[PDB]
Curated annotation (Swiss-Prot):
UniProt protein name: (6-4) photolyase
Protein family according to the UniProt entry: Belongs to the iron-sulfur bacterial cryptochrome/photolyase (FeS-BCP) family.
Keyword Mitochondrion: no
Phenotype reported upon loss of the gene: Cells lacking this gene show a strongly attenuated photoreactivation after treatment with UV-B irradiation.
Catalytic activity, reaction form: (6-4) photoproduct (in DNA) = 2 pyrimidine residues (in DNA)
Amino acid sequence: SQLVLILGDQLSPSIAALDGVDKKQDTIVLCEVMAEASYVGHHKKKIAFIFSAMRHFAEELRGEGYRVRYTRIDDADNAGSFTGEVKRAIDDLTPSRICVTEPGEWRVRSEMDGFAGAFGIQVDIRSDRRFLSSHGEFRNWAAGRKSLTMEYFYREMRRKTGLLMNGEQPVGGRWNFDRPKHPVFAPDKITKEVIDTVERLFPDNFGKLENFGFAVTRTDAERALSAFIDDFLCNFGATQDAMLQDDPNLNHSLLSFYINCGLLDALDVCKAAERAYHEGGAPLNAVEGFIRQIIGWREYMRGIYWLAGPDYVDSNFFENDRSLPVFYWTGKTHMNCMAKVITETIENAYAHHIQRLMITGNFALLAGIDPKAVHRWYLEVYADAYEWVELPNVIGMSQFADGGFLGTKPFAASGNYINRMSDYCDTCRYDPKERLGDNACPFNALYWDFLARNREKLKSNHRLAQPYATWARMSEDVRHDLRAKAAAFLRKLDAAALEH
Ligand SMILES: Cc1cc2nc3c(=O)[nH]c(=O)nc-3n(C[C@H](O)[C@H](O)[C@H](O)COP(=O)(O)OP(=O)(O)OC[C@H]3O[C@@H](n4cnc5c(N)ncnc54)[C@H](O)[C@@H]3O)c2cc1C
Ligand SMILES: Cc1nc2c(=O)[nH]c(=O)nc-2n(C[C@H](O)[C@H](O)[C@H](O)CO)c1C
Ligand code: SF4
């Protein structure tokens, strides 16, 4: 007999751990355990989504003739951790070996590495076939290459998969090329019970549970993918970086949550976009861009995470110590852009790429926040957030706390960028055209202060040469007044964070 452990982000009937299962003899284990629901203060909607999808996935496996041992969060006898439930199901089932698909967190991986010793039974940890590249392949692609960039990896993924390839050439001669309501799925009985249970057990957690609309079945997630292809995929590249106060979704797909937990397969999503391309329903730039986000960025981020090692989380290139601002938890800031995106995050457990990078992340970058505080908040607030995908985006891409290890440039931008790409300023109490004075957008002074105080470390970064040139053309008193303006704003933040 076999004990097949399946984690909350492994909700696919093709997950590796299921290869070679004897439906008559083996038992699948799913457990809602407190260790996983509390290692960070997850968004209420995140906990609700995961538990619901784990429950529906349990029912689905039972529906496919699998034997499933489920453990709910408020079940008594619940041992509170993966290992504990592993003990219970062992004693229970006296199985011949444990089978599990490798996880997406160093924390969980390490626990699971402890199984073979803890139980004195052979543990079979299987490589997660949901990723195009294994750890060894990513290591070997990166080995020797004195600079990591997503692009090169992406091209190797394009060749590997055959997506948008005309044999050995990229479709359209080049690898690279840079509204209706979104679907809502009404909570069924299971989901409503979960929502109630979560609100009961995690009432102080970040976020609201009101208007939960997530797909929690494979079918509904496939319906969200289909709705994306039909309604938004055609305009996906045309608005990738735009923000709108009245529209939190725009042409984004909102599929990450399903992809990241096994309700959708990344490769199938790409094939959907490609199929749409050939049938004429989307331009090549939008479909290439879309796919590049999945077999490029997503795959590359996972590779970076496992390559950098667990202490990657400690990266602090600029040696920041400042605590996270209080308004990331409350959204009560006069900065309209930050108030909108944070409020959306509180309400919806979602924000699109450019929001995470250029509003809340950009702010945290310019403000010199302890990178670890930033990683923590990103991992908690979004229902697509797991350390393998969140951490490289935060440490590497947004915060540059790894010093550019993953090839990106510093994404520091002023109120000029945000005014240019959004309509948040239109109703903000701050003036983004003003950099000094009490009405000045905080991002202007903060942008220059960031560049100034980190000048030694960013001196030789070609991308910032124009800004430094401009810095150097300002009178000394202008540079002084800007830095002081920044310091006064940071003061206000540090003061607010003292009440703690
Ligand atoms: C600070 C920060 C934190 C982030 N944290 C996460 C996270 O915890 N989980 C997560 O899945 N994504 C994360 N991203 C990437 C990106 O913001 C989200 O994947 C995207 O907003 C998800 O919504 P969507 O599915 O509508 O994306 P779309 O705009 O529809 O893009 C298509 C798909 O590509 C993938 N994708 C796009 N960009 C990235 C990226 N930078 N890294 C990895 N995959 C990407 C997603 O699977 C996404 O569903 C983060 C980015 C930043 C700057
Ligand atoms: C909140 C939460 N709860 C559970 C759970 O009860 N059971 C489970 O298997 N997984 C959960 N997850 C996902 C995991 O904690 C972890 O992030 C993934 O296993 C990473 O591979 C999360 C994020
Ligand atoms: S003005 Fe500065 S703060 Fe007010 S919204 Fe535009 S950018 Fe955000």
